[PDB]
Design a protein around this ligand. Structure first.
Ligand SMILES: Nc1ncnc2c1ncn2[C@@H]1O[C@H](COS(=O)(=O)NC(=O)CCCCCCCCCCOc2ccccc2)[C@@H](O)[C@H]1O
Length: 545
């Protein structure tokens, strides 16, 4: 039923089995290990549940404001144990944190003494005696709020979680009868305050019944090779990452750091949370196949917080499948398949069985014929019931109703994803986020394709954004370069020409910025939203000024 009850079952079956292992690279460049069996994490959880019960009631929200580590896991679990709606947030570094706190009106804050320095009662869980030897007041419905201009908290129920896990276990392990191997372990460096990192690092170990090897996204960014190192531990690894993490690892990992790594036991590496670029997948597999990385272990995956996490993934037992389409028709709105190597390449996602996806005209609420691009709509029991205390926004995002649905298609409710895609053959494809699209003379260009063009030339971070000006959208590219005045001219004319010939677009402004200037998250590739208003308020410093 609930995560607390599943954790108590983990303790019953395998009290002394290892549940969570956290590798901390902050003091020791090589990582200090600290591990909890099922019984020990349960004890900590119960102690946190006792402490939160002094401050909040069943149903109250509990904000978690801790760094990545075991204390975060035990704050979150202890909150669910005492029947509180957890709110996983990031450690203060912030304005969106106070906006979330105002929205969720929490009755307790769970944090650590270290960031205690950075009103509801505040608990430093590390300063609690967490290993001192009941509180099962768990809810059977709402587990936690997942926060993503006003901050909207996705209500995630235990039903959402279990349904998404059943869909996930079945698609990821369809080749083994929806049974994961005995050898499975979870490895993740993804932040626990993002949906991918929370469901994979914290929730999955309990629901699947395996242990997790965990670390911090700052450890991964410092030395991406550690990711491969930790996945190559004993057993069959299951991990996940955004596309730029695949690129970064292919780029910055030294073959000396990988002395004697066996990557052949890695069960699954999901690639998600952003557009999956075939070129990235090929660079990753071509560079790490030497260590026995299996190509069928790379699994592109699509989802969003509003669907708990998972919507679709590639066929189990096969390497990712790539399809090719004519780009002029793609911008026109039509998917026309073309020969291998011609046109744009898109990762083929098999139409999922559960949840179900449809391609729908956002202006008429009617399905699109195959090959016609529209908005991806999602139906299924993993789709959240709404945004916390936001009835109107809930209605606009979750209340998709299909007019004259096709045979076998529910009328509603549909989750409108904001993503543009199409169906070809019996696979569907994701173009990208609609708000990020560049519309020029009635045509639609995707910023992921523009940035993939620019990157190959720059080898750095990009953002292709749309700046409105006197009734149209103008193309602007924020381009990170390594840090003379001719060399700058070489890159500007190269990139400008590459966008001209590959897209038929004129670049209205190329902003050469230093590395780190484009807003990125720890798990977000680029916030093209933020780029637009940083550029409009002239907050960028160029290298050629
Ligand atoms: N594959 C993709 N291609 C293109 N765009 C993608 C995309 N995925 C997300 N996006 C973009 O990102 C938007 C959503 O952003 S978001 O709300 O913050 N959330 C996200 O993006 C998260 C989506 C990730 C996909 C599935 C992650 C699996 C999670 C762990 C499995 O645990 C298990 C399960 C079983 C066994 C062991 C472990 C989406 O609206 C879309 O625009």
């Amino acid at each position: 039923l609930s995560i607390p009850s599943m954790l108590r079952q983990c303790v019953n079956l395998h009290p002394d089995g290892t549940a969570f292992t956290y590798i901390d690279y902050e003091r020791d460049s090589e990582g200090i290990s600290e591990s909890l069996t099922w019984s020990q994490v349960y004890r900590r959880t119960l102690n946190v549940a006792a402490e939160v019960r002094r401050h909040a009631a069943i149903g109250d929200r509990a904000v978690i404001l801790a760094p990545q580590g075991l204390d975060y896991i035990v704050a979150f679990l202890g909150a669910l144990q005492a029947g509180l709606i957890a709110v996983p947030l990031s450690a203060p570094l912030d304005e969106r944190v106070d906006a979330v706190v105002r929205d969720a009106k929490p009755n307790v804050v769970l944090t650590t003494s270290a960031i205690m320095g950075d009103s509801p009662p505040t608990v430093a869980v590390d300063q609690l005696d967490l290993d001192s030897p009941i509180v099962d007041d768990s809810l059977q419905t709402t587990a936690y709020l997942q926060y993503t201009r006003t901050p909207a908290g996705v209500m995630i129920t235990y039903k959402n979680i279990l349904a998404n896990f059943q869909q996930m276990i079945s698609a990821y392990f369809a080749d083994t009868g929806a049974v994961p191997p005995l050898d499975l372990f979870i490895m993740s460096w993804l932040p626990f305050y993002h949906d991918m990192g929370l469901v994979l690092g914290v929730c999955a170990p309990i629901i699947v019944g395996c242990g997790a090897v965990l670390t911090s996204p700052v450890a991964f960014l410092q030395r991406p090779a550690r990711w491969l190192q930790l996945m190559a531990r004993e057993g069959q690894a299951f991990s996940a990452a955004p596309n730029f993490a695949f690129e970064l690892t292919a780029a910055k990992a030294i073959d000396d750091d990988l002395a004697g790594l066996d990557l052949g036991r890695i069960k699954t590496i999901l690639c998600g949370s952003e557009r999956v670029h075939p070129a990235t997948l090929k660079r990753f597999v071509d560079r790490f196949s030497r260590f026995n990385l299996r190509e069928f272990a790379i699994r592109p995956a699509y989802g969003l917080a509003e669907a708990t996490v998972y919507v679709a993934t590639s066929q189990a037992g096969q390497p990712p499948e790539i399809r090719y389409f004519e780009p002029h028709e793609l911008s026109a709105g039509q998917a026309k398949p073309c020969a291998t190597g011609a046109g744009t390449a898109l990762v083929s996602y098999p139409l999922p069985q559960s949840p179900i996806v449809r391609i729908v005209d956002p202006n008429t609420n009617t399905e699109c014929p195959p090959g016609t691009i529209g908005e991806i709509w999602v139906h299924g029991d993993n789709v959240a019931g709404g945004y916390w205390e936001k009835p109107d926004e809930t209605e606009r995002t979750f209340g998709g109703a299909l007019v004259a649905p096709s045979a076998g298609t529910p009328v509603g409710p549909w989750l409108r994803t904001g993503d543009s895609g199409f169906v070809s053959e019996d696979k569907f494809f994701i173009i990208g986020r609609i708000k990020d699209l560049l519309i020029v003379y009635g045509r639609n260009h995707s910023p992921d394709d523009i940035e993939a063009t620019i990157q190959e030339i720059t080898r750095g971070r990009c953002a292709a954004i749309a700046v409105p000006s006197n009734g149209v959208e103008k193309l602007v590219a924020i381009v990170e370069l390594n840090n003379d005045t001719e060399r700058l001219s070489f890159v500007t004319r190269e990139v400008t020409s590459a966008i001209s010939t590959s897209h038929g677009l004129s670049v209205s402004d190329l902003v050469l910025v230093a590395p780190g200037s484009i807003p990125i998250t720890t798990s977000g590739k680029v916030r093209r939203a933020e780029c637009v208003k940083l550029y409009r308020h002239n907050e960028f410093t160029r290298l050629d000024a």
